[PDB]
Amino acid sequence: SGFRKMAFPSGKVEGCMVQVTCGTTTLNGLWLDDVVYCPRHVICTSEDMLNPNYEDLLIRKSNHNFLVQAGNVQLRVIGHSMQNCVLKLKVDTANPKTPKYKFVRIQPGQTFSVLACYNGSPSGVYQCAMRPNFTIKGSFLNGSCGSVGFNIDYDCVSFCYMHHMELPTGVHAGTDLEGNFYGPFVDRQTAQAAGTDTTITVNVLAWLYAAVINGDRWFLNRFTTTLNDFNLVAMKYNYEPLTQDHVDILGPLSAQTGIAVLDMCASLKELLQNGMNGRTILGSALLEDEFTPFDVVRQCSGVT
Amino acid sequence: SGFRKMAFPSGKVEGCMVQVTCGTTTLNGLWLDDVVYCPRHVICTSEDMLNPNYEDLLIRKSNHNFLVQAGNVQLRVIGHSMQNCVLKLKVDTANPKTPKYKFVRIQPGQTFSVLACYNGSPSGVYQCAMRPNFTIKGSFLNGSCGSVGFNIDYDCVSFCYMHHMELPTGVHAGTDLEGNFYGPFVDRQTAQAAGTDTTITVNVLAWLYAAVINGDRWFLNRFTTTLNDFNLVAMKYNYEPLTQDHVDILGPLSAQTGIAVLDMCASLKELLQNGMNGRTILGSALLEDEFTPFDVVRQCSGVT
Ligand SMILES: C#CCCCNC(=O)C[C@H](Cc1ccc(F)cc1)NC(=O)[C@@H](Cc1ccc(Cl)cc1Cl)NC(=O)[C@H](N)Cc1ccccc1C#N
Ligand SMILES: C#CCCCNC(=O)C[C@H](Cc1ccc(F)cc1)NC(=O)[C@@H](Cc1ccc(Cl)cc1Cl)NC(=O)[C@H](N)Cc1ccccc1C#N
């Protein structure tokens, strides 16, 4: 029993973190086989960051302008290329700690673990969701750029995020591992705004199912609702519309608890309309939306 | 910027997790140099668990009654001993992945990371505090026994917890790595109750300092209070008394924000008396008490 924000074990990713230096700028890189992946703004100065032309800045660099450190051992760069917003540095040594891995680009509402690093050295691990507005509410200080997000599936590491920048609101924006930003953002030091966020409805429902699995039932009721009437309420409270694909994803948890999805929607609706009234759910005084249906199944038991 | 429940990177501990089997009972073990550490109730049957005599049960066992698996490779047990509530199994192979490490017994209110494992295989990582009543609010399923809690300091792994059991309330109890339980608990399948818990005052204050560091100020006020008048309020709301050692621990955060400790106590008092009134602090609708002063400094920047 119990329910915690749980990250994947980070060891397979720890053995891939390196430090990349170009001029005075240092950030983190990801070392897989013989290629090091990092944000391309490592090739920028403070002046270049205002409005950079990266093709221009990179053509002015050679392999020896880049310093790669793995532990204390320095790696030799034998080639370099740019792919979207990530820099690829070919090195002379294949990383012997390279896990089985894939690059995947995730959908808003999916979760992943972040291994926050500074100067190539892992400092901590936490759980994140990709918000509907394509930012993440991370914990990142200067020098965290190049930290990656990932999921693990049977010793295959699926990398899905690389950290690039913090926006004026304090939230964070980055790319997939092929350098494509999540959301409309671009890698220049201009003030960019995220669109207004919404609550990840399917995740709030998964977490309500987690609460039932752990014996929390005070919020349930006998009422049920329709998909359409619930979505009217969702709109009113800035919740993502609930799709039928989302109803179907919640199937396993619905069956394991006996509570039909649209039955749980009536409880959420009532929770949205009446608040918690001082009570808590799984130790929280607000509705949590950074657990997917998959996260709940993985962490919870197969029996209530 | 940002503030997350952050665990230590788990890789150094991942390379130490093994599976220990005795009869039909399997749980997790910790493999350091040539010794495997695990809960002693691995030598129990379902019948033995009601009221075991462990010296009796262990004298009836030989080395070959214990199966140790590291990955798929089986380890050979060449000796065994009991120390308090942990079993020590000597094996023929020193763990080549043994980190620099120490065993430490922590105080209530301190935090640590848990690497939850099943059948010797790590499944996830999360942050925990030792509650004042010497339980932890973990996330543990059957088979998690032997999972360990740890802190990391400059590549030294300080192990401080081994998981043994879940109590009727759903919270969890375990030992230090020398087998001494935290709290009054014993390792038999009787219904034991934890004492009533209290809120970790010094940690709530550290977290309020975290909020200021991240630009959250709506809860501050101009009032200050005395240590004695605050402790009257603490008692009323089931908060640990605040000691002078605790005031002094909060020194660095006080200086970095300019807010004196007893100044922050007046804000906490007002928060305790008036509630949040719908607002949140670092994304939470209640006062968080599982971040130590040290956790806040480690995760936050040196400048507000
Ligand atoms: C609550 C709350 C808000 C608190 C105040 N928040 C900030 O002051 C962060 C601040 C906000 C901001 C945004 C646009 C601006 F015009 C001016 C300022 N963001 C940065 O200064 C950007 C500027 C930048 C560099 C490079 C590129 Cl490609 C894009 C961008 Cl936007 N620096 C970084 O993101 C570092 N790579 C990494 C870094 C540095 C410093 C602090 C954190 C990080 C991280 N992580
Ligand atoms: C909300 C809420 C509460 C929900 C209901 N909670 C439970 O049903 C857990 C249940 C509560 C309980 C306590 C005392 C009893 F008399 C009877 C039952 N606890 C267990 O069944 C103990 C019994 C036990 C075994 C060995 C020793 Cl040494 C001591 C103890 Cl007490 N089993 C374990 O702790 C496994 N080692 C590991 C394990 C098994 C199953 C589930 C979780 C775990 C873990 N982690």
Swiss-Prot record, chains A, B:
3CL-PRO exists as monomer and homodimer. Only the homodimer shows catalytic activity. Interacts with host FBXO22; this interaction promotes the proteasomal degradation of nsp5. Changing Q189A: Does not affect ability to cleave and inactivate human TRMT1. Cleaves the C-terminus of replicase polyprotein at 11 sites. Recognizes substrates containing the core sequence [ILMVF]-Q-|-[SGACN]. Cleaves and inactivates human TRMT1, preventing tRNA guanine(26)-dimethylation of tRNAs. May cleave human NLRP1 in lung epithelial cells, thereby activating the NLRP1 inflammasome pathway. May cleave human GSDMD, triggering alternative GSDME-mediated epithelial cell death upon activation of the NLRP1 inflammasome, which may enhance the release interleukins 1B, 6, 16 and 18. Also able to bind an ADP-ribose-1''-phosphate (ADRP). Residues 1-304 form the Peptidase C30 domain. Changing L205V: In strain: Zeta/P.2. The active site is at H41, C145. This is 3C-like proteinase nsp5. The gene is rep. There is a cross-link at K5, K90 (Glycyl lysine isopeptide (Lys-Gly) (interchain with G-Cter in ubiquitin)). It catalyses: TSAVLQ-|-SGFRK-NH2 and SGVTFQ-|-GKFKK the two peptides corresponding to the two self-cleavage sites of the SARS 3C-like proteinase are the two most reactive peptide substrates. The enzyme exhibits a strong preference for substrates containing Gln at P1 position and Leu at P2 position. Residues 1-304 are cytoplasmic.
